[PDB]
């Protein structure tokens, strides 16, 4: 009778719902992991190559002519368009440092916005990591409490009557930790991996700014 599967089937409905809720939370934290691991791998793999192509660039118009080969989903092409658009909107200006300040502000906000867009699912991982121990312990305490109500009702001294109830209660802690540990680890992996990706994207945005900054100073110098 008392396999681990039989131990679930004989337990109280409250702790059975706790076990099912922790199994579903486990399915979610693994579905988020397989979803995002592939996505961050593809974006990291692409962006690292776009940076190698742009490393050859000497002026912003040449960086545009390189980046026109990049797909319309590419983040480096997006940044370069965020820079080029601040030029075309400013076409009447004789002040150049206003173009530099406005472009730096736009690109810094774009890098932050992309970095935030990476994080969409992480609220589930953070929550499931934080609450799964507590949901497990509620299942354990409820099972233990229910067993002592059993002893009060059946008025029987023998602790061997409590041993099944203790196993059923400890299983809720075990399943609680099996839901918690992957979620806490994977949240820390993605938090570090997003920080690494934001920094790589910032290094591309910095090259766009450096290219524009030389290009404007050379053009303003060559005018006199």
């Amino acid at each position: 009778d008392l396999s681990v599967w039989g131990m679930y089937q004989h337990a109280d409905i409250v702790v059975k719902c706790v076990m099912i809720g922790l199994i579903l939370a486990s399915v979610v934290t693994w579905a988020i992991f397989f979803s995002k691991s592939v996505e961050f791998f593809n974006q990291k793999r692409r962006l690292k190559r776009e940076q190698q192509l742009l490393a050859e660039a000497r002026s912003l118009n040449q960086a545009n002519d390189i980046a026109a080969d990049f797909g319309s989903k590419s983040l480096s092409l997006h940044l370069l368009n965020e820079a080029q658009n601040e030029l075309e909107l400013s076409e009447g200006s004789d002040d150049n440092e206003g173009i530099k300040e406005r472009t730096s502000f736009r690109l810094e906000r774009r890098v932050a916005a992309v970095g935030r867009q990476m994080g969409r699912g992480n609220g589930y991982l953070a929550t499931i990591g934080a609450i799964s121990p507590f949901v497990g312990l509620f299942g354990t305490v409820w099972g233990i409490m229910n067993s002592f109500i059993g002893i009060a009702q059946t008025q029987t001294t023998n602790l061997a009557v409590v041993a099944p109830g203790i196993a059923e209660a400890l299983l809720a802690t075990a399943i609680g930790l099996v839901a918690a540990i992957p979620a806490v680890v994977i949240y820390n992996v993605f938090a570090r991996q997003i920080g690494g990706f934001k920094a790589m994207l910032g290094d591309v945005a910095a090259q766009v700014l450096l290219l524009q900054s030389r290009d404007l100073d050379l053009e303003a110098s060559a005018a006199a």
């Binding site: 599967w5 399915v27 579905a31 988020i32 397989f34 979803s35």
Partner: peptide
């Protein structure tokens, strides 16, 4: 969506019990 199908597949197997 493969992620959720692959997740419920790897769990389904371990939850055979």
């Amino acid at each position: 969506p493969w992620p959720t199908l692959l997740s419920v597949c790897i769990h389904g197997a371990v939850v055979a019990g």
